[PDB]
Amino acid sequence: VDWRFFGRTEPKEENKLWFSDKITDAYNMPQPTFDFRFPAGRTSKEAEDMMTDMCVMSAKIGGFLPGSLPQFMEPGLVLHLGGTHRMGFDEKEDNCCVNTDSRV
Amino acid sequence: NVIQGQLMSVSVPVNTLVVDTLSPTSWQASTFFVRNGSNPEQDPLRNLSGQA
Amino acid sequence: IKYDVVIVGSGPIGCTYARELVGAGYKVAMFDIGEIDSGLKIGAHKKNTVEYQKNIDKFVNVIQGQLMSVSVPVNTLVVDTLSPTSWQASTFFVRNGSNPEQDPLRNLSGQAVTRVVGGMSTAWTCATPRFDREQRPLLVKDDADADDAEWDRLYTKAESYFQTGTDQFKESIRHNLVLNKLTEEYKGQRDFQQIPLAATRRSPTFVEWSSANTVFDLQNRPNTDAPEERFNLFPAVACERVVRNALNSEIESLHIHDLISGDRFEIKADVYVLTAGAVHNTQLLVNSGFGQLGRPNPANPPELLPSLGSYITEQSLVFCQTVMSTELIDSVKSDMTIRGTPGELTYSVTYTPGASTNKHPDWWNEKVKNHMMQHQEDPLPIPFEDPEPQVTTLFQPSHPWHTQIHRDAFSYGAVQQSIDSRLIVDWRFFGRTEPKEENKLWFSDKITDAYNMPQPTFDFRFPAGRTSKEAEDMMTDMCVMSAKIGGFLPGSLPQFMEPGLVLHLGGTHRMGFDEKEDNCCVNTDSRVFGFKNLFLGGCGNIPTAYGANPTLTAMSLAIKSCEYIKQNFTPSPF
Amino acid sequence: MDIKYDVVIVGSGPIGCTYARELVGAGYKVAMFDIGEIDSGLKIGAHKKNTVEYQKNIDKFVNVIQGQLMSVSVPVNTLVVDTLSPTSWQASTFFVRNGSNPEQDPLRNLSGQAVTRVVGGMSTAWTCATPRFDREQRPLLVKDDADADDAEWDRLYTKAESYFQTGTDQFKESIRHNLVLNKLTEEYKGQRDFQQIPLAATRRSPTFVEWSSANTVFDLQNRPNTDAPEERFNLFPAVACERVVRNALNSEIESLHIHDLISGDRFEIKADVYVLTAGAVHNTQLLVNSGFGQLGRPNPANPPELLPSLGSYITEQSLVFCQTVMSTELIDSVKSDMTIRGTPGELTYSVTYTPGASTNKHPDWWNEKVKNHMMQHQEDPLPIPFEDPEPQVTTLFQPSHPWHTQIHRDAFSYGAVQQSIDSRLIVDWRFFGRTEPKEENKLWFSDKITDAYNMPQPTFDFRFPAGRTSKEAEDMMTDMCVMSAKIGGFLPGSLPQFMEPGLVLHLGGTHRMGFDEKEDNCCVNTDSRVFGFKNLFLGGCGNIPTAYGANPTLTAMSLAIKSCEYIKQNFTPSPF
Ligand SMILES: Cc1cc2c(cc1C)N(S(=O)(=O)O)[C@@H]1C(=O)NC(=O)N=C1N2C[C@H](O)[C@H](O)[C@H](O)COP(=O)(O)OP(=O)(O)OC[C@H]1O[C@@H](n2cnc3c(N)ncnc32)[C@H](O)[C@@H]1O
Ligand SMILES: Cc1cc2c(cc1C)N(S(=O)(=O)O)[C@@H]1C(=O)NC(=O)N=C1N2C[C@H](O)[C@H](O)[C@H](O)COP(=O)(O)OP(=O)(O)OC[C@H]1O[C@@H](n2cnc3c(N)ncnc32)[C@H](O)[C@@H]1O
Ligand SMILES: OC[C@H]1O[C@H](O)[C@H](O)[C@@H](O)[C@@H]1O
Ligand SMILES: O=S([O-])[O-]
Ligand SMILES: O=S([O-])[O-]
Ligand SMILES: O=S([O-])[O-]
Ligand SMILES: O=S([O-])[O-]
């Protein structure tokens, strides 16, 4: 049995996806670059509590399979990236890009 | 394998692995220069390395 | 030719018999199959060199190089990328010293032995906890107070012999960080303390770890320091058999093989003491007509020591390492006023000495201040030479495992360079195993080992029921407790270790009050049932399910055994 | 500890022990210091593989070797660990950690270079191969007279061989040895010569070899003693030697500064003669910490005043390695003399041969071993006895193949260990290249970073020179692939590869010898005396100034013998 637990990450202004003005990708478009860390308080404390929960819960079923021991996966392997063009009611108050009709 | 073959990494930092068992006749780097489509803008320690 | 006492094995249990009995005026000989290997201090800890205390990671290799596997099943790995010209096997035949008796799925693959003077005490981690009642063999039946008093006396003496202490690591910032956080988190429900360690600190960067040598210096006697004592140690002597009289009431000789000359001799003593380890005591006994040689055959049960080699116990062992939390690292410098950016003109780190509101005492804040000011290139507040953590919460009925939360060298230990060593903490939890008649160490009647002795073979599974339920609860407990200090270090994720890599095998020649009722081989004086003059020492005596490290307990039994000898045999006039 | 001796020797390796052998024997009052400790049993400085347990378990000795090799210069680590838990303390930079050396360029290093600090030095662990160098690999000891040069080398090498107990027939009864030896002789008939590796060892039984070591050279026991009542020698382990004090004239050493590691105390030791035998790295370190050469990153805009060639022109050998699994043809050839009737395990099974038959391809002793193994071990499918000793074959360096070779089995730090393939089938191949000395290849010492003993941190600036050295290194790989194939294919997991630079541990030329300090770009003369100084001598592989592929220790020993002759003729032992 596979066990995959997925944490929630607080949105923080400093966590960014930006694009190079000099380096280009394979289609000749501005190269994506990340400036990302998991925020240090709730997100981090929940992430480790989440690991603990997986270890506790999975043990009710069976022990770990050697070679597939409990681990964090490489950041972003999960492919659930959000908030890069985020929604809210007000561009300024809600620090956002599109409204609730998804209109820019 | 099908999944792996269609996930292209978003941002790959410049590689600094040391390969010091090349034959003396092989062309050998003096620096960790930008190669193989890596992104010299990317801090390896503030990345989403698995993003694809 | 003739001795009062002959001791087989120079580990710490043999050296307990030597200490006691040489001291009491007996003419003693000790034989070890291995050779002198720790410098001028015979049988001392190999880790007590300056070089190894500066390079503790490297000592893992020393350990690996002296642990020889007990039973290796026939190898069935498929190599099908040989060149077509290379000689290529048609079957999985016996090779490279493998044991074809061994079922690879009912083994203790990690079990190994060390054949050097001082035995495994040349390499061990020096943890010497007492067993609580739940884990401890009874010495007195039906009087808990008298049993406690007997054990308290014996342990207190064993602790003197090993120079056990609980203070040698008190000035370690890492130690305190880890111990204090755990105590806070358990909110009274568990007790943490320093691992009791057989060691004496010599300086802030040097610890003299104990060993057999600390117990008994293994110097031949008489000598200038001991002009009236009599002791000879004979290394490179493979002890092969003890000869029984026809009554099975006495041992008449010890048969040995001198490995350097190749010759075989016998040795006469009044008293024979086997302290060759849990595996090799059993081997020597079986090779002597005790128990049963060969694959166990219940239809023809042995008439002598039928419990020999049955009810074997080995601990489950789980291991991980962690990387210290950001919270804990920031806590180290919590009393500091820090201004400016490291490396620049205006940077400063200060604290108020003696302030009652400081979290930490002055010696700590001074260390942290000076590290931070003197090493502005370094991003951590922990001094470079800070000693290792040495923390435990001892076995209790509500958490029936032993714990060590520490850094030290062991054969499966981990070595990496990417993460700063000051952040890394090892976690080892040891489970207790119920003794079960079906769990066996037996010896082949045809296959032999590298010393031409019957080949050891295990038939072992961890018992279902409580042992297994606890082992898995223990794993979870390690995952829960470690998380309070930091996440797992990649590459050292939580796992069970190969069965027997822990090297805590017990019960192979177990102790009890009554041979038949207690399914056992030695009585509480460690005397083999029926035999006037044959004693066994070591962890193989321990008949209980135990999770703590067993050597202190085995030494306590050996001291009691010595008291019986002193009471019952007279030393020869000197 | 007295404070005055006739001679002081830093280092108890085999080279230090050559000086002790010669000079204690000549009646000098000698003291020897080692930073490491007594570690091989009651035979002080002896080979650690000389236990009954290691000869029954040779593969375990690899771990012993690994545990006593401490890396010289470890660059700052830049591996990315991005699967830490979010709560774990996480680096923002690749900062200096775990004793790494921020002076070290990771791409111009000898990353495998390591040192051993134990009494006996590396001779407690080495593989005991002691070939002589031919003229092409060897420095000149006589100019302009090649036959005189050869005669002097033969004298010194013959003496060195006696000291080490070098021999070439301890493996002559091995079936695997002869199988391989003979096959290679045949395949290269009249193109290359194969022989047993000359090994510093004495066989004691069919299953036990007493490997030589420093202890063999000199037993390291304090003197006077019963066997040597008029000799004077004291060994002081756990003593870091830190500096030799130069007079202001730079013509004499005045004292040796030491640090007793057990007490913590520092002392000044006085001798008439000072001999540094601390290894190629540590000799150089001690001399630099004493004002020789130049401390800090090399700066040609102010060459040093004293010994400007110190730590330049360093050489380390290219090393290639693989293992093979013996060919079917070779295995069948072991039993070619046997007549076989029946099936193994049947009552009628019979393996016989005819002693002394003219048609036999092997001697009677070989056939008797094969027959007895086949008959006594009918479950075993190979004709090679279980206790058959290891192969120990070489074809020595020549101009048409300018590398040393070892076609053998033994324990080394990079050694391989698997359980799947029968060990009797396995042969190791190690080919060793010669490296041209070049001024730019350097071993220098930091003026800020310190090592674990508080001495200036060694740093390498090294690449294999780009022409002959490089072209030979790759031709050497090719040669290994070509030659090894005559024996069997490669063992998976031990494919042909270059080893990490300096793992080979044959570093030379760090304090190199020549006739003239300036013309020959060197540090010591042919008596191993430091130019300018009346009473300071260096011994070891750092003296060797040439490009050499063969194992260097026998050659370093021969130089030290010559050094001792000079000392004996110019300094008077104190009266006893
Ligand atoms: C290798 C190792 C072992 C330990 C540890 C770490 C490591 C890395 N750590 S922790 O990490 O596990 O936790 C321990 C620790 O902290 N605490 C502890 O109590 N035990 C530790 N062990 C286990 C103890 O070392 C072990 O319990 C005791 O040493 C056992 O003492 P003793 O009963 O004396 O056995 P021995 O194996 O040490 O010595 C036996 C000697 O007998 C010789 N011998 C064997 N057969 C012989 C024969 N036929 N003839 C003659 N001589 C013949 C052997 O050569 C040996 O010298
Ligand atoms: C580890 C190793 C080494 C070798 C081998 C295999 C293995 C597994 N093999 S093969 O596989 O390559 O082939 C060799 C072989 O077969 N043949 C050979 O010629 N050389 C081998 N080596 C190399 C030789 O061992 C080496 O050339 C000699 O030992 C050099 O002798 P010497 O020059 O005496 O150096 P040392 O390193 O042994 O001893 C130096 C002593 O100095 C001490 N020391 C250092 N600094 C000190 C200081 N500051 N103060 C006081 N003492 C201070 C050290 O403690 C040491 O004891
Ligand atoms: O056995 C007699 C005595 O021998 C010794 O001297 C031991 O040190 C001691 O504890 C013991 O009581
Ligand atoms: O003969 S007595 O030992 O039972
Ligand atoms: O020897 S006793 O157990 O009868
Ligand atoms: O005949 S040998 O292999 O025992
Ligand atoms: O001291 S002189 O002879 O180089």
DSSP class per residue in C103-137 = -GGG--TT-EE--BTTGGGGT---B-PPP-GGGSP
C205 and C117 together in one domain: yes
Q: What are phi and psi of C481, to 5 degrees?
A: -70, -40
The tokens for C484 are 């309070």
Residues C1, C6, C12, C18: is their CA dihedral positive or negative?
A: negative
D53 and D191 together in one domain: yes
Supply the CATH number for residue C354's domain.
3.30.1920.50
**DSSP annotation string for C164-233:** EES-TTTT-HHHHHHHHHHHHHHTTSS--EEPPEEEEEEETTEEEE--HHHH-----EEETTEEEEEEEE
The interface residues of chain D toward chain B in range 470-499, judged by CB-CB distance below 8 A, are 470-471, 473-474, 477, 497-499
Strands A16-24 and C237-244: unpaired
Q: What are phi and psi of C310, to 5 degrees?
A: -105, 165
C-alpha–C-alpha distance, residues D229 and D110, integer Å: 46
Q: Which residues contact C291 (CB under 8 A, 6 or more apart)?
A: C282, C285, C302, C304, C305, C306, C308, C309
Torsion of CA C32, C35, C36, C37, to 10 degrees: -120
The secondary element (H helix, E strand) that includes residue C68 is: strand C68-69
Q: Residue C532: helix, strand or coil by DSSP?
A: coil
Report CB contact under 8 Å: D473, B23: yes
C-alpha–C-alpha distance, residues C35 and D53, integer Å: 9
**Residues D390 and D201: beta-carbon distance below 8 Å:** no
D368 and D463 together in one domain: no
Which among D83, D84, D87 is the nearest to A45, CB-wise?
Answer: D87
The tokens for D143 are 């100019």
Q: What are phi and psi of C480, to 5 degrees?
A: -75, -45
Give the strands of the sheet with D166-167, arranged side by side.
Answer: D166-167, D199-205, D208-211
Number of DSSP helices (H) and strands (E) in chain D, helices first: 11, 24
The tokens for A26 are 């394979």
Identified catalytic residue from D441, D525, D543, D551: D551
Whether the ω angle into residue C222 lies within 30 degrees of 0, i.e. cis, is yes
Strands C226-234 and C27-31: parallel
**Residues C177 and C425: beta-carbon distance below 8 Å:** no
Q: Residue C402: beta bridge partners? A: C430
**DSSP annotation string for D105-136:** -GGG--TT-EE--BTTGGGGT---B-PPPPGG
Report CB contact under 8 Å: D329, C85: yes
Q: How far is CA D42 from CA A46, C67, C363, D189, D219, in A?
A: 59, 22, 44, 47, 10
Q: Whose C-alpha lies nearest to ligand 3, atom 1?
A: C20
Counting beta carbons within 10 angstroms of the beta carbon of residue D89, is it exposed (0 to 12), middle (13 to 18) or buried (19 or more)? buried
Q: Over the range D453-470, which residues count as b (16 or more CB within 10 Å of their CB) and which as e?
A: bebbbbbbbbbbbeeebb
C-alpha–C-alpha distance, residues C256 and C268, integer Å: 11
Torsion of CA C88, C93, C99, C104, to 10 degrees: 80
Q: Which residues contact C491 (CB under 8 A, 6 or more apart)?
A: C414, C416
**Residues D270 and D247: beta-carbon distance below 8 Å:** no
Q: Whose C-alpha lies nearest to ligand 3, atom 10?
A: C20
Against chain C, the chains showing at least 3 CB pairs within 8 Å are: A, D
Of D362, D388, D414, the one marking the end of a domain is D388
Gap between the terminal Cα atoms of chain B: 15
C494 and C428 together in one domain: yes
Residues of C with catalytic annotation? 504, 549
Which amino acid is present at D462? F
D497 and D544 together in one domain: yes
At CA B21, angle to CA B18 and CA B22, rounded to 5? 100
Q: Which residues in chain C have Cβ-Cβ distances shorter than 8 Å to A69?
A: 493-495
Counting beta carbons within 10 angstroms of the beta carbon of residue C242, is it exposed (0 to 12), middle (13 to 18) or buried (19 or more)? buried
Method: X-ray
**Residues C254 and C275: beta-carbon distance below 8 Å:** no
* D506 catalytic residue (yes or no): yes
C-alpha–C-alpha distance, residues C128 and C118, integer Å: 17
Determine the distance in angstroms separating the CA of D554 from the nearest CA of chain B, rounded to an integer. 27
The secondary element (H helix, E strand) that includes residue C350 is: strand C348-350
Q: What are phi and psi of D372, to 5 degrees?
A: -65, -40
C-alpha–C-alpha distance, residues B32 and D350, integer Å: 66
Q: How far is the CA of C517 from the centre of ligand 5 (A)?
A: 14
Q: Tell which residue, D512, D563, D506, has the closest CA to residue D129.
A: D506
The secondary element (H helix, E strand) that includes residue D433 is: strand D426-433
Maximum C-alpha span of chain D: 89
Of D388, D407, D435, the one marking the end of a domain is D388
Q: Tell which residue, C139, C135, C159, has the closest CA to residue C149.
A: C139
Q: What are phi and psi of C401, to 5 degrees?
A: -145, 155
The secondary element (H helix, E strand) that includes residue D215 is: helix D214-217
- Cβ atoms within 10 A of the Cβ of B36, count? 7
C214 and C67 together in one domain: yes
Gap between the terminal Cα atoms of chain A: 43
Report CB contact under 8 Å: B45, D82: yes
Q: Which residues contact C133 (CB under 8 A, 6 or more apart)?
A: C144, C148
Torsion of CA C475, C477, C479, C483, to 10 degrees: -160
Q: Over the range C24-45, which residues count as b (16 or more CB within 10 Å of their CB) and which as e?
A: bbbbbbbbbbbbbbbbebbbbb
Q: Alpha helix locations (H) across C288-444?
A: 326-332, 362-374
**DSSP annotation string for D464-522:** --TTHHHHHHHHHHHHHHHHHTTTEEEPTTS-SEEPPTTTT---B-TT-B-S-TTTTT-
C-alpha–C-alpha distance, residues C368 and C349, integer Å: 9
A57 CB within 8 Å of a chain C CB: no
Q: Which residue of A has its CA nearest to B51?
A: A76
Which among B41, B48, B50 is the nearest to A23, CB-wise?
Answer: B41
Q: How far is the CA of C20 from the centre of ligand 3 (A)?
A: 5
Q: Whose C-alpha lies nearest to ligand 1, atom 11?
A: C125
Nearest-atom index, ligand 6, CA of D386:
3
* D362 catalytic residue (yes or no): no
**Residues D395 and D401: beta-carbon distance below 8 Å:** yes
Q: Residue D282: helix, strand or coil by DSSP?
A: helix
**DSSP annotation string for D347-415:** TT-EEE--TT-TT-SS-HHHHHHHHHHHHH-TT---SS-TTPPPPEEE---BTTB-EEEEEE----TT-
**Residues C572 and C182: beta-carbon distance below 8 Å:** no
C381 and C415 together in one domain: no
Q: How far is the CA of C543 from the centre of ligand 5 (A)?
A: 19
Q: Which residues contact C231 (CB under 8 A, 6 or more apart)?
A: C18, C22, C28, C29, C30, C219, C220, C221
Ligand 3 pocket at CB < 6 A: C 19-20, 23-24, 566
C-alpha–C-alpha distance, residues C566 and C556, integer Å: 16
- Cβ atoms within 10 A of the Cβ of D576, count? 11
Strands C68-69 and C112-113: antiparallel
Q: Among all chains, which residue has been given the structure tokens 């290799």?
A: C61
Q: How far is CA D343 from CA D338, D375, D377, D382, in A?
A: 14, 11, 13, 14
Which among D82, D85, D90 is the nearest to A51, CB-wise?
Answer: D85
A34 CB within 8 Å of a chain D CB: no
Q: Among all chains, which residue has been given the structure tokens 């804990």?
A: C328
Nearest-atom index, ligand 4, CA of C247:
1
- Cβ atoms within 10 A of the Cβ of C264, count? 11
D292 and D350 together in one domain: no
The tokens for D146 are 């090649």
Q: How far is the CA of C135 from the centre of ligand 5 (A)?
A: 26
Report CB contact under 8 Å: A52, C480: yes
Strands D4-10 and D266-276: parallel
B31 CB within 8 Å of a chain A CB: no
D219 and D170 together in one domain: yes
How are the residues of chain A apportioned to helix, strand and coil, as percentages rounded to the nearest 5? 15, 15, 65
Mutate to test the interface with D, among B23, B28, B42, B47 (most CBs of D within 10 A): B23
C-alpha–C-alpha distance, residues D559 and D563, integer Å: 6
The interface residues of chain D toward chain C in range 90-119, judged by CB-CB distance below 8 A, are 90-93, 95-98, 100, 117-118
Q: How far is the CA of D279 from the centre of ligand 2 (A)?
A: 6
The secondary element (H helix, E strand) that includes residue D328 is: helix D328-334
Q: Over the range C56-83, which residues count as b (16 or more CB within 10 Å of their CB) and which as e?
A: bbbbbbbbbbbbbbbbbbbbeeebeebe
Whether the ω angle into residue D224 lies within 30 degrees of 0, i.e. cis, is yes
Counting beta carbons within 10 angstroms of the beta carbon of residue C226, is it exposed (0 to 12), middle (13 to 18) or buried (19 or more)? middle
Q: Tell which residue, C329, C399, C369, has the closest CA to residue C135.
A: C399
D92 and D159 together in one domain: yes
Listed by the residue before each break, gaps in chain D with C–N over 2.5 Å are: none
Q: Which of D370, D377, D380 to mutate to test the pocket of ligand 6 (most atoms within 8 A of CB)?
A: D377
Of C351, C371, C386, the one marking the end of a domain is C386
Q: Which residue of A has its CA nearest to C319?
A: A69
Which among C65, C84, C94 is the nearest to D60, CB-wise?
Answer: C65
C-alpha–C-alpha distance, residues D9 and C379, integer Å: 42
C-alpha neighbours within 13 Å on the C-beta side of residue C514:
4
C250 and C149 together in one domain: yes
Angle between helices C362-374 and C173-186 (to 10 degrees): 130
Residues D542, D543, D549, D553: is their CA dihedral positive or negative?
A: negative
Q: Tell which residue, D178, D169, D127, has the closest CA to residue D391.
A: D178
**What is the resolution in angstroms?**
1.7
C326 CB within 8 Å of a chain D CB: yes
Q: Which residues in chain B have Cβ-Cβ distances shorter than 8 Å to A24?
A: none
Q: Which residues contact D215 (CB under 8 A, 6 or more apart)?
A: D17, D40, D43, D44, D45, D46, D47, D120, D123
How are the residues of chain B apportioned to helix, strand and coil, as percentages rounded to the nearest 5? 15, 0, 85
Strands D208-211 and C68-69: unpaired
C-alpha–C-alpha distance, residues D500 and C324, integer Å: 33
Q: How far is the CA of C531 from the centre of ligand 4 (A)?
A: 7
The interface residues of chain C toward chain D in range 150-189, judged by CB-CB distance below 8 A, are none
D398 and D339 together in one domain: no
C423 CB within 8 Å of a chain D CB: yes
Identified catalytic residue from D362, D404, D506, D511: D506
Q: Is C532 a pocket residue for ligand 4 (Cβ < 6 Å)? A: yes
The tokens for C128 are 């010497």
User: D372 is in which domain, residue-wise?
Assistant: 327-388
C-alpha–C-alpha distance, residues C44 and C208, integer Å: 10
C-alpha–C-alpha distance, residues D443 and D546, integer Å: 17
Question: Could you give the number of structural domains in chain D?
Answer: 2
Q: Which residues contact D418 (CB under 8 A, 6 or more apart)?
A: D491, D493
